[PDB]
Structure formats: structure tokens, C-alpha cells
Design a binder for this molecule. Structure first.
Ligand SMILES: N[C@@H](Cn1c2c(c(=O)[nH]c1=O)CCC2)C(=O)O
Ligand SMILES: N[C@@H](Cn1c2c(c(=O)[nH]c1=O)CCC2)C(=O)O
Lengths: 259, 259
């Protein structure tokens, strides 16, 4: 009856503006993993959709003061969009306010260094200060450290929230650029699948080291009680079971790898 | 109000009989990953429970003809249990008849060989016959090959269902024993986490080879429309975020690894 409003975010290689996008219109000006994923889900759920880029360019966090949800989560919570299709992490605080399909991608927080950086693990970073390190300000990664009770991760958090100048960045591209220009003096803590993607991008000067600090997954989100919830969940399971999600990952990560 | 009836299955190291269990009673008779997980979930959701072993010793499949569900899924579907806590794979067909919490453990189908077997991937396997290979005669792994349309997995499936003598086994233990006693002439297709578990068990003559064929997860299951659903799902997320699920895996997989 109505065109589904999808909220997503400009994050390579999930959703990106096609080259010379000015000559394009609607959904055709975007390309990426979640762009392809959106098409598949729509086709399987039988619905027309419109891709929109989240107004504040954020994922989703609740302000402790105003208790207001921002980012894509907020878009769904306050009814500005019908569904969110992006690298959105399934978390307890978010699951309490919105619904998540089963994960369409598995991942965990990882460490990105400039090749050559004498860092092999989180503990390595924790017991040193020569090499600074941070995370995306805002996001599930930052929250992980902020809420963790585990010795190593709590030590890291006390360091990061106190660091000066700030060790946090506004976007992934900023973290990546910061690592690249810090001559091995800055390590970026980000989600493994993004870490892996950048490792295959010129100038091929970064790499993921160590194991993941945790294990989470990205899920398709819908506002609570949404009628699309059930169908989308089944669509995600179906797509994964047919190997489609694996192919989409290959296509955007390695088929187009530049290293 | 009522003691929650938990249905689980004897599958090491998820649920196992303690030494001299005849000396013990109730839940104290069992130990393992799911036993610990069950206790953690119950504590967080605030309910008393009784661990029970699924009658037919199966995970859950629908009979094509009678369309009746067996195993743990069947116990939930037909109201014989309130919740299922075990290495139960989240699949589309199952999600259509029961509810699953988000995954508490990630996995994928993998290849188990006796040390020295000249096999490294599903493709090697599919391109030969001297080395027999199969899976459990029941479960998601078997179902994966049965419904797969990917050339490699289809070829493998056509071989397995035609194979004589039968390459399917009644249980993991049998799959392992067959691998262990086949002089390298039999490979077992099983879920990664079990493969990894057995690789750390004496005689230490088996190992995992190649990447996983797929990417899936185990979830706590409840009957569709169960009131326990929400709280359980939230509990799994919390346990994961606090890092308890990772601790339980280390404890049952590596802390007591015998190799
Ligand atoms: N997925 C997270 C957002 N997010 C993302 C990346 C990261 O490194 N850290 C992080 O928190 C890379 C892409 C998105 C969320 O939902 O908050
Ligand atoms: N997890 C599956 C059951 N199962 C299991 C293993 C396997 O190798 N294959 C399989 O289908 C080892 C652990 C249990 C299900 O839910 O049906």
C-alpha cells in the first residue's frame, strides 16, 4: 500500500554514492553491500522502497540527559523510517527499543594499525602509551569499551576518555586517515569486517592484527511491532542459506580489492 | 510461577553426564556449556527450571509426509517443553515454527579429517571417491547439503545420498569414531565448534581443514508466542556483552583441552 522508507548510512562499502551520481536519481545513485541487500530483501518481502541517508549521519545512541535516540535507531523509534538497512550492530539497549532480524553479518571489534606498528593485541595497547588509540566517537564500539568491566578493556577506556587531544573520530574514514598519517603512532579500534575491507584498499598500508575482542552481528532493524519484522527476518535467513550474503561480501570486499 | 521445562541434548561439551551422576539428582546430574548457560539465563530471567533430555535424542526436522516435527523443536512445537537450550541451529524452516533468540554462538559447517588426510576443502572432497564423507543422518548440516543449489555442495549431496554403505551417522561420537578408525578414508562434515572441540581431545588424531562452508548461529528456542521469548533474547545479548559466552567457550573448549 505504501513505499517503504529505508534509512541507511554512507559507509563504504555498505552504501556509497555512485560516481557521477548527479546524473542519477532515487535509489540508482547509491551502490554497495546494503544497497544490494536492500534490493534482495525488498524482492523477497514484495515491497517497494526508497533509500534515504540518515539525517545526522549516526548509527544510534540514547542521550543520557534528553533520553532521546539519535541516528538510524532514532529514525525508527520516532517513526521517520520503516526499516534500517546498514552495518547496524545488534545490542541489548537497542533491542529494547527496536526489533532486529537475525544477523546478516558476523563480526567483532578489531585493531587496525599502520603496517609496521609494534602492536599485536589489545593488551599490547593497554600496557603502553606511545601509540595512541581510539574508536569512533558514538557507536557500539565506543559503548563496548565504555561499559566493559574486563580489566584490559576498562584500562583502555579510562585511557581513551581521558586522552588529549581526543583519540575519537567522527567517521570510519577519519579513523582510517588518522592511522595512515600517524606514522604508526595511532591504532584504530573498529569492527573487523570494516578492518578487512580497508586492508584491501590502496594504498594498502593498513592491516588487522590480533583476534577480535568480541563477537556480535549486524541486523536489519524495524520499529517495534512493525508488520515487516517477521517477513524481513525470514528473508535474511533465506538469503544467508542460499549463500547470497557470502557472495555480496565477496563482491564488495575482495572481488574489488585493490591490493 | 511454574518450573520451566528445559529440553536439551547429550552432546559434548554442551551437556554431559557428570562422573558418577547416579549419585546426584535433578540438574546436578549434568554439566557443560549449555548447563552453565541454562543457569545464567534462568538467573537473569528469574525462573526455576528442570533440565530434561530430548526423548528421541534429535535436534529437529519435519517429516515430509506426516509433517510432524521431531527432536527438541518438536518438544517445543507440541508443548512438551518450555524452552530449548542446546547447540540448536537457527534455520528458516525452524524459525517458521518456533522462536529463536539472537545467536549465543557462531559457527559454520566444516571438514574433520584424521591427521594426514590429503584433503583441504569441500572441493577436494567433491572431486574424489577414495575418501568417503558424510554428516549426521539428521540435523541442519545434513539439511544444508540436501537443499543447497551450489554446484560443489550439490555434487557432494548427490554422492552422500547415493553412497553405499551409508556415510551418515547417528551421532557426533559415531562420526568422530568413524573418522578416527578409518585410516584416513572417511571425512566428517560437522559444525565448526564441534570440530574445534574434538581437535582438543585425545588421541588428538583429528583436525579441522579449510574454511567453513557457511556461517550460522545457535539460538535459545521457545514456542512461538511464548512469554519467555523476550526476556531470554535480552538475556543472551547481556551475557554476550558482559563476555560470559566467550568465557564459557574457553572453559569448555580450551581450559580443559587435552592436546
Ligand atoms: N556497527 C556500529 C557502528 N560502527 C561501525 C564501524 C566501527 O568500526 N565501529 C562502530 O561502532 C564500521 C562501520 C559501522 C553500530 O551499529 O553502532
Ligand atoms: N546444530 C544442528 C545439529 N548438528 C550438530 C552438529 C553437526 O555436526 N551437525 C548438525 O546438524 C554438532 C553439534 C550439533 C541442529 O540444530 O540441527
Amino acid at each position: 500500500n505504501k513505499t517503504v522508507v529505508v534509512t541507511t548510512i554512507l559507509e563504504s562499502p555498505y552504501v556509497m554514492m555512485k560516481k557521477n551520481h548527479e546524473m542519477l536519481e532515487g535509489n540508482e545513485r547509491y551502490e554497495g553491500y546494503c544497497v544490494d541487500l536492500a534490493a534482495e530483501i525488498a524482492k523477497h518481502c514484495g515491497f517497494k522502497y526508497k533509500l534515504t541517508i540518515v539525517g545526522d549521519g549516526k548509527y544510534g545512541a540514547r542521550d543520557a540527559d534528553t533520553k532521546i535516540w539519535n541516528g538510524m535507531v532514532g529514525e525508527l523509534v520516532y517513526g521517520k523510517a520503516d526499516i534500517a538497512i546498514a552495518p547496524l550492530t545488534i545490542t541489548l539497549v537497542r533491542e529494547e527499543v527496536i526489533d532486529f532480524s537475525k544477523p546478516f553479518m558476523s563480526l567483532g571489534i578489531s585493531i587496525m594499525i599502520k603496517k609496521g606498528t609494534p602492536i599485536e593485541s589489545a593488551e599490547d595497547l593497554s600496557k603502553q602509551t606511545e601509540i595512541a588509540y581510539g574508536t569512533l566517537d558514538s557507536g557500539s564500539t565506543k559503548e563496548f569499551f565504555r561499559r566493559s568491566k574486563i580489566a584490559v578493556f576498562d584500562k583502555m577506556w579510562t585511557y581513551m576518555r581521558s586522552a588529549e587531544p581526543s583519540v575519537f573520530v567522527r567517521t570510519t574514514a577519519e579513523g582510517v586517515a588518522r592511522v595512515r598519517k600517524s606514522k604508526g603512532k595511532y591504532a584504530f579500534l573498529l569492527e573487523s569486517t570494516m578492518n578487512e575491507y580497508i586492508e584491501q584498499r590502496k594504498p594498502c598500508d593498513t592491516m588487522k592484527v590480533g583476534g577480535n575482542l568480541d563477537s556480535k552481528g549486524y541486523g536489519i532493524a524495524t520499529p517495534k511491532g512493525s508488520s515487516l519484522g517477521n517477513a524481513v527476518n525470514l528473508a535474511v535467513l533465506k538469503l544467508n542459506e542460499q549463500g547470497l550474503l557470502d557472495k555480496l561480501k565477496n563482491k564488495w570486499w575482495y572481488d574489488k580489492g585493490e591490493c
